Amino acid sequence: SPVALRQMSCAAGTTQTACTDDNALAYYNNSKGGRFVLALLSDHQDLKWARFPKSDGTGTIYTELEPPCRFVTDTPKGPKVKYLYFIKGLNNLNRGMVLESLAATVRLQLEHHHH
Amino acid sequence: LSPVALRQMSCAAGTTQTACTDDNALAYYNNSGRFVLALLSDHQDLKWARFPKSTGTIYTELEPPCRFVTDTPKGPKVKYLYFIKGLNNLNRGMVLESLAATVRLQ
Lengths: 115, 106
Fold this sequence. Notes:
The structure is a homodimer.
Chain A: E1 6-13, E2 22-29, E3 36-42, E4 49-53, E5 60-64, E6 69-73, E7 80-86, H1 92-103
Antiparallel strand pairs in A: 1-2, 1-4, 2-3, 3-7, 4-5, 6-7
């Protein structure tokens, strides 16, 4: 059942060329095929591609995003408007997963280490 | 009904409404009132669960259970996941994600 969602920074943009670097936060799990990206969380409202380098290091990958959902969140600095991007074709089951994970941060391991 | 980190509450379930008597199950719910999405339990015969309303009490039917293993502070354990009758996939996705992130390695 551990289809637990992990997160990491990634490159995103309005065009494949426009992708540059840590421009967003990507939600993914390991559904066999290495890393499977489900959604992007960013401050930018017109992103259309999430970019990740291939596993074997032989090229790169660009995944398509659906138009984002705009939403507010509270923070120490105050309210903040964020954009949630589900990848194209993502089903409601996976959308729900992203949501719960977004609702409360929880470490997936016990050892002193990133999430 | 909007998004919010799921919460859990102990509740009584049974194979019949009459059977629901003592707390023997954990119920995931959304409070965006309490909307119960699913039940986690050690028994596999469960078919009903009651929730003493926020006046009266509520009985909600359950769908067939799903077996699954879980680490705990005292060794692994087997358990059963029950979804409320007719739950949509978006909500099930929220439950499955909570369960999935419920493990302990090394």
